[PDB]
Write an enzyme that holds these catalytic residues in place. Structure first.
Site, PDB file in Angstrom:
ATOM      1  N   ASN A   1       0.737  -1.147   0.070  1.00 16.92           N
ATOM      2  CA  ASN A   1      -0.072   0.032  -0.272  1.00 16.92           C
ATOM      3  C   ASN A   1       0.673   1.189  -0.123  1.00 16.92           C
ATOM      4  OD1 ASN A   1      -1.809  -1.935   2.152  1.00 16.92           O
ATOM      5  ND2 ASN A   1      -2.503  -1.299   0.026  1.00 16.92           N
TER       6      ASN A   1
ATOM      7  N   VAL B   1       1.647   7.026   0.726  1.00 21.60           N
ATOM      8  CA  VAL B   1       0.804   5.898   1.373  1.00 21.60           C
ATOM      9  C   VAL B   1      -0.451   6.064   0.664  1.00 21.60           C
ATOM     10  CG1 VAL B   1      -0.412   5.325   3.570  1.00 21.60           C
ATOM     11  CG2 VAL B   1       1.875   6.158   3.684  1.00 21.60           C
ATOM     12  N   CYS B   2      -1.171   4.901   0.294  1.00 18.43           N
ATOM     13  CA  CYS B   2      -2.349   4.845  -0.251  1.00 18.43           C
ATOM     14  C   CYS B   2      -3.206   3.944   0.366  1.00 18.43           C
ATOM     15  CB  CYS B   2      -2.252   4.154  -2.011  1.00 18.43           C
ATOM     16  SG  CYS B   2      -3.643   3.952  -2.944  1.00 18.43           S
ATOM     17  N   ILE B   3      -4.114   4.554   1.136  1.00 16.72           N
ATOM     18  CA  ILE B   3      -4.986   3.584   1.998  1.00 16.72           C
ATOM     19  C   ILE B   3      -6.742   4.710   1.651  1.00 16.72           C
ATOM     20  CG2 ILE B   3      -3.773   2.642   3.634  1.00 16.72           C
ATOM     21  CD1 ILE B   3      -4.186   5.093   5.425  1.00 16.72           C
TER      22      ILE B   3
ATOM     23  N   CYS C   1      -2.843   5.436  -7.027  1.00 19.34           N
ATOM     24  CA  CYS C   1      -2.842   3.850  -7.088  1.00 19.34           C
ATOM     25  C   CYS C   1      -4.105   3.273  -8.138  1.00 19.34           C
ATOM     26  CB  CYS C   1      -3.117   3.297  -5.920  1.00 19.34           C
ATOM     27  SG  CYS C   1      -4.508   4.032  -4.578  1.00 19.34           S
TER      28      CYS C   1
END
Lengths: 76, 171, 981
Positions: free
Chosen positions: B82, B89-91, C580
């Protein structure tokens, strides 16, 4: 009773509301079916902007009353 | 010129976090020059793959905060599905608002103006404990964690060591 | 072939088909006074087939109160003849003409008939014919602070789009054979009774996937019925419904039969009782006029008012209208009967102009049918309002004086305003000010600022600008234009070309603001609005704010020591996407477009800037090695673009572009698939490529494919643009080079101190390439020949083909990639009207908050709503009230220590934290090591130290904010502090 919340886009939201329900209560429900936080919602009824802490009764919002959910725009 | 709502909120939140600091991370400003640029040092959570490690990150808050979420970048080298190689950070909680399009992810699970920086950091801690495979930012890390988690385990532990050797930099 | 260069922003509101219909619709406009010309201006800019004017009555001076196309030299001339030439210049695709006489049979030439300044009797004649031959009819009149609109599009008018909203959609969970549809877990359909929906991917009964729409019957928030589908399938599931926008029959009553029982559109539910009063009064104006040879009641004339009041009784009785007449309210219409306010015309004219477009496009829901509006709170009270003061004079402001008086005119004349923005709203605002006679007095002035220049796209809703004015500054042209509308403003307007913000505080500083009466925004972003708001809070100046979006608009007024400020509230932010999602897992066209934009920047801009900085800066290499997010990509960019991948011919650029195809639509997809095979599964049993994820598929290049070839040309042409090589359009050349292309074989891949960036040594020195620069591509949506949108569209759609996403034409792509805001003249005119109706309240110095009104409207659905501004938050401290927003502390340039000691007993609050702007000066939680260091410093010194910037000379103040706790433990927010240097 029953009220209406019409948006600037034309969408009409119907709500079964208690005369005891707070404006905060109503703002929370509108977020749960449109996806905008309460602090960004602008509700208007009979020429005054609804503020938190009060109730529908404080504004005399009886049945078949129509609220307007508006917003400010950025274009020029 | 008075201060915006953004500036006022960051002060109160900076004060509260720097009053009763929740264990696991330390929060401060990169520079008092700006309260919109926080630096965060995170202790690798206990028992997890990262335990013993010391990770430095940067919370960059947008000008229109809290309408938008902050962006968190790990400066410390880290290996996580993630976490993009560039450090970002990718959440979910840090994903911008909100619903749409087809009706998969709801607005209440992403960013909300009410989420304090503390709520975010706690979410990034649990992220280190249990990777989310529905939003991988590092493809290579996402595979290694799945097809050979013992070489992934190895590479993380190597980066955990390299983080300690960087604490010695203060010389 | 509609001019997309001109109608861009408007097309995104109405659509192409709507505009085709428009370009085939003729429009007749009766009357060219204040209201008529406004309607005509908008219709001309909107783009109908033609506009015909009827107004043979000669120009009187009092017409100039709002008719901005009439000058004093044109007095005595028939208005229509004067107006036509001005209107023709608005739009090169719209011819304007005049008629000297009208006949009922002549109306058949038109799709819609607009009627202003006409008696009720003649209105009935006109409407009887049009309603009979199904010709659209719109009547509208502006009478002082009162306004009326009536619409009639026939008994069989069909509406194809009632709100312009996108078709609703949702994923199905199950459908009983009885017809009850159920959404997925906790999902609302948002449908309503009468709506039509089709289906797709419904498993169990593939018959519903036909496309045949079914009438919806709402059963609950999560369910709705469509009808028994027992014919095919016993039960369905896992489908998706899609709203089918159905043509809607709207049955309009004629003017004759609707006068007895009129259907109302209420612009204010707070004034629910008023429209019926107006319904009689506006007829009484017509009955009165017939009884006085066309003349309306004189200003504040008690005799005519009583005589007018009697007509209301007669009309109310004849029509069998059982309503109790409000004498105070009715006579106010008589008192203001001859009133002609520009704000009112701008408001009604915009609304009416939208309605014309509705009648001609069958798009958007019309007013059905009577729209009675008043802005009576705008009436002054700080000055005498009587028959003497409202008496006409030989000047142009009679129509305004007829309501506000002669001494109020003096107040307007002496206003000193600051207009931030010369765009659409800016133009309409300056026009209104010119008509009202703002800043025409000796002590009056107008300051307008806008750093933007006129573009072709702008001419569609910025009517002070013309095609030849493209390239010039908006602020200067807007000023010169209104000087012609009102020569009284000659030498009374100063134009700036400055972006309003921190950088320009030297120009818009202390001396500039102090002499202002009020500020007015005409901005296109929120950041600027917030900034101006805070400056206005400091200088305690009023702020008039407005904004638009397509057919939507709003107005807010900020009153010192009364209302909250613009920054006291916030609005939903612009939609964005995480990296993403964009880098590997797109599922919308909007995802691939965003990706395509980063690709555009990544290929033709970012590497180019690195090259140009490497050649121009002396220590760039080691500076980038130190202070760059990714030193690797910087170096690889220099190498690739200067020596390795540098083209020598355009054919090498074609070779290059052919290579980029494989890199971004083939190999990378193979690589992604090798990491996540098509049959992958995540650690929860669910397949990886499911739901928001869509399993991609590599692309094999095919020159005969449309999108494949469109990419090559765009990519190659852009690559050539970086090195200054000439592009080629001849497809023959591409076929040749591409035929001889052998794709290098690609396969998905599986004490350091590995600084292998000794490749910076492999780079030629800046000294070897002195005077050599590459040309970076600066993204520009509005030039359709630079391959920018072409590239985005091709790349976006290629990636759309990868992930099985429905592609989009360059038109939708241009809208998304360009972040274009839909906009048209109608909504801009309406907000400009409401803003000026609020300005006159500020001039009157109204201290009651309930007198002010914040506006919100949507012209697409005839929705208008207003509300009292929220009051500023108060806080009684030690006795009397303080204003948390507007009140301030005025202190000397003291030291931090004795500043904290100032609030020690002068207020009884411990300063827990102190900040200046975004900078933290002091906090009680800061370490004592620098506390003791920074405590004895003066604020001026303390600020200069932390900000690493020396206070500019023009700075005579300094604003601080503090968090304060009372001797109890809990915090108390307090007014800000102004430090005097």
């Amino acid at each position: 009773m029953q009220i209406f919340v019409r948006t600037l886009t034309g969408r009409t939201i119907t709500l079964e509301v208690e005369s005891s329900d707070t404006i905060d209560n109503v703002r929370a429900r509108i977020q749960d079916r449109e996806g905008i936080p309460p602090d960004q919602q602008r509700l208007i009824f009979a020429g005054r902007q609804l503020e938190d802490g009060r109730t529908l009764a404080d504004y005399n919002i009886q049945r078949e009353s129509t609220l307007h959910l508006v917003l400010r725009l950025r274009g020029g | 010129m008075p201060s915006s709502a953004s500036e006022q909120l960051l002060r109160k939140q900076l004060k509260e976090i720097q009053k009763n600091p929740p264990q696991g991370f330390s929060v401060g400003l990169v520079d008092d020059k700006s309260i919109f640029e926080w630096e965060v040092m995170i202790i690798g959570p206990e028992d997890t793959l990262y335990e013993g490690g010391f990770f430095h990150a940067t919370l960059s808050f947008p000008q229109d905060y809290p309408l938008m979420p902050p962006k968190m970048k790990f400066t410390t080298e880290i290996w996580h599905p993630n976490v993009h190689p560039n450090g970002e950070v990718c959440i979910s909680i840090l994903h911008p608002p909100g619903d749409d399009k087809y009706g998969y992810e709801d607005a209440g699970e992403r960013w909300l103006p009410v989420h304090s920086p503390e709520t975010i950091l706690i979410s990034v801690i649990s992220m280190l404990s249990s990777p989310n495979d529905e939003s991988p930012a590092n493809i290579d890390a996402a595979k290694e964690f799945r097809e050979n988690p013992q070489e992934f385990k190895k590479r993380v532990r190597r980066l955990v060591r390299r983080s300690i050797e960087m604490i010695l930099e203060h010389h | 072939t509609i001019d997309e260069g001109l109608y861009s922003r408007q097309l995104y509101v109405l659509g192409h088909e709507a505009m085709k219909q428009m370009s085939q619709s003729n429009v007749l406009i009766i009357g060219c006074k204040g209201l008529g010309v406004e309607i005509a201006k908008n219709v001309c800019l909107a783009g109908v087939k033609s506009v015909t004017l009827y107004d043979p009555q000669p120009t009187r001076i009092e017409d100039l109160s709002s008719q901005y196309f009439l000058t004093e030299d044109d007095i005595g001339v028939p208005r229509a003849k004067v107006t036509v030439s001005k209107l023709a210049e608005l739009n090169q695709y719209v011819p304007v003409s005049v008629v000297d006489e009208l006949s009922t049979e002549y109306l058949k030439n038109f799709k819609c008939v607009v009627v202003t300044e006409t008696s009720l009797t003649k209105q009935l004649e006109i409407n009887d014919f049009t309603h009979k031959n199904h010709i659209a009819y719109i009547a509208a009149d502006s009478r002082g602070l009162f306004g009326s609109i009536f619409c009639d599009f026939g008994e069989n008018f069909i509406c194809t789009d009632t709100d312009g909203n996108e078709p609703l959609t949702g994923m199905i969970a199950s459908i009983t054979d009885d017809g009850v549809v159920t959404m997925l877990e906790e999902t609302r359909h948002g449908l309503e009774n009468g709506d039509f929906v089709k289906f797709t991917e419904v498993k169990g009964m593939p018959g519903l996937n036909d496309g045949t729409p079914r009438k919806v019957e709402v059963k609950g928030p999560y369910t709705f019925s469509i009808g028994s589908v027992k014919d095919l399938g016993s039960a369905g599931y896992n489908g998706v419904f899609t709203q089918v926008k159905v043509p809607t029959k709207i049955s309009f009553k004629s003017l004759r039969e609707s006068l007895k029982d009129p259907e109302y559109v209420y612009p204010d539910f707070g004034k629910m009782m008023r429209p019926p009063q107006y319904h009689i009064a506006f007829q009484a104006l017509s009955a009165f006029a017939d009884a006085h040879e066309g003349s309306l009641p004189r200003p504040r004339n008690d005799i005519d008012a009583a005589e007018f009041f009697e007509f209301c009784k007669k009309i109310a009785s004849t029509l069998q209208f059982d309503v109790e007449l409000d004498e105070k309210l009715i006579k106010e219409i008589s008192y203001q009967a001859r009133g002609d306010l520009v704000a009112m015309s701008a408001f009604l004219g915009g609304a009416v102009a939208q309605e014309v477009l509705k009648a001609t496009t069958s798009k958007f829901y019309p007013l059905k049918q009577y729209f009675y509006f008043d802005s009576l709170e705008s009436l002054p009270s700080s000055v005498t309002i009587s028959e003497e003061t409202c008496k006409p004079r030989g000047c142009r402001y009679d129509g305004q004086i007829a309501v506000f008086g002669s001494e109020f005119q003096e107040k307007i004349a002496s206003l000193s305003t600051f207009l931030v923005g010369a765009g659409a709203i800016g133009c309409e605002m300056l026009k209104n000010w010119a008509m009202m006679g703002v800043a025409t007095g000796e002590s009056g002035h107008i300051s307008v600022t806008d750093m933007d220049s006129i573009e072709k796209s702008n001419l569609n809703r910025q009517f002070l600008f013309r095609p030849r004015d493209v390239g010039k500054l908006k602020s200067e042209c807007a000023s010169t234009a209104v000087s012609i509308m009102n020569p009284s403003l000659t030498g009374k307007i100063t134009s700036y070309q400055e972006r309003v913000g921190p950088e320009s505080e030297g120009i818009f500083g202390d001396e500039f603001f102090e002499k202002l009466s009020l500020v007015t925004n005409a901005l296109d972003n929120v950041e600027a609005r917030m900034y101006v708001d805070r400056r206005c809070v400091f200088f305690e100046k009023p702020l008039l704010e407005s904004g638009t979006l397509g057919t939507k608009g709003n107005t807010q007024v900020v009153v010192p020591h009364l209302t909250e400020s613009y920054g006291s509230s916030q609005d939903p932010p612009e939609k964005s996407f995480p990296i993403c999602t964009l880098k590997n897992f797109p599922n919308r066209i909007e995802h691939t477009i965003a990706w395509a934009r980063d690709l555009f920047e990544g290929l033709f801009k970012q590497p180019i800037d690195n090259v140009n900085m490497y050649l121009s800066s002396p220590n760039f290499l080691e500076t980038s090695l130190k202070t760059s997010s990714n030193p690797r990509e910087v170096l690889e960019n220099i190498r690739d673009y200067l020596v390795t991948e540098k083209p020598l011919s355009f054919e090498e650029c074609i070779m290059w572009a052919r290579l980029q195809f494989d890199k971004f639509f083939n190999n990378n997809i193979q690589q992604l698939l090798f990491n996540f095979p098509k049959d992958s599964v995540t650690s929860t049993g669910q397949p990886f490529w499911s739901g928001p994820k869509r399993a991609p598929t590599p692309l094999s290049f095919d020159i005969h494919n449309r999108e494949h070839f469109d990419f090559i040309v765009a990519a190659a042409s852009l690559y050539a643009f970086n090195y200054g090589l000439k592009s080629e359009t001849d497809p023959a050349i591409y076929e040749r080079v591409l035929a001889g292309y052998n794709p290098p074989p690609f396969a998905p891949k599986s004490k350091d101190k590995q600084e292998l960036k000794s490749i910076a040594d492999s780079l030629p020195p800046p000294s070897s390439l002195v005077g050599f620069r590459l040309t970076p591509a600066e993204f520009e949506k509005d030039d359709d020949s630079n391959h920018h949108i072409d590239f985005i569209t091709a790349a976006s759609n290629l990636r759309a083909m990868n992930y099985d996403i429905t592609p989009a034409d360059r038109f939708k792509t241009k809208f998304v990639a360009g972040k274009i805001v839909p906009a048209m003249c109608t909504s801009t005119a309406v907000v400009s009207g409401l803003v000026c109706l609020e300005l006159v309240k500020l001039v009157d110095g109204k201290k009651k908050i309930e007198e002010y009104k914040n506006g919100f409207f949507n012209l697409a659905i005839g929705l208008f709503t207003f509300s009292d501004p929220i009051a500023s938050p108060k806080m009684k401290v030690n006795g009397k009230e303080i204003d948390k927003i507007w009140d301030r502390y005025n202190l000397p340039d003291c030291t931090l220590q004795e500043l904290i000691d100032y609030f020690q007993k002068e207020e009884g609050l411990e300063v827990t934290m102190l900040s200046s702007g975004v900078s933290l000066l002091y906090a009680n939680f800061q370490p004592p090591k620098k506390l003791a260091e920074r405590l004895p410093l003066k604020i001026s010194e303390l600020v200069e130290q932390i900000t690493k910037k020396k206070l500019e000379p023009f700075r005579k103040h300094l604003v601080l904010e503090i968090c304060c706790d009372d001797a109890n433990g809990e915090d108390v927010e307090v007014p800000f502090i102004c430090i005097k240097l």
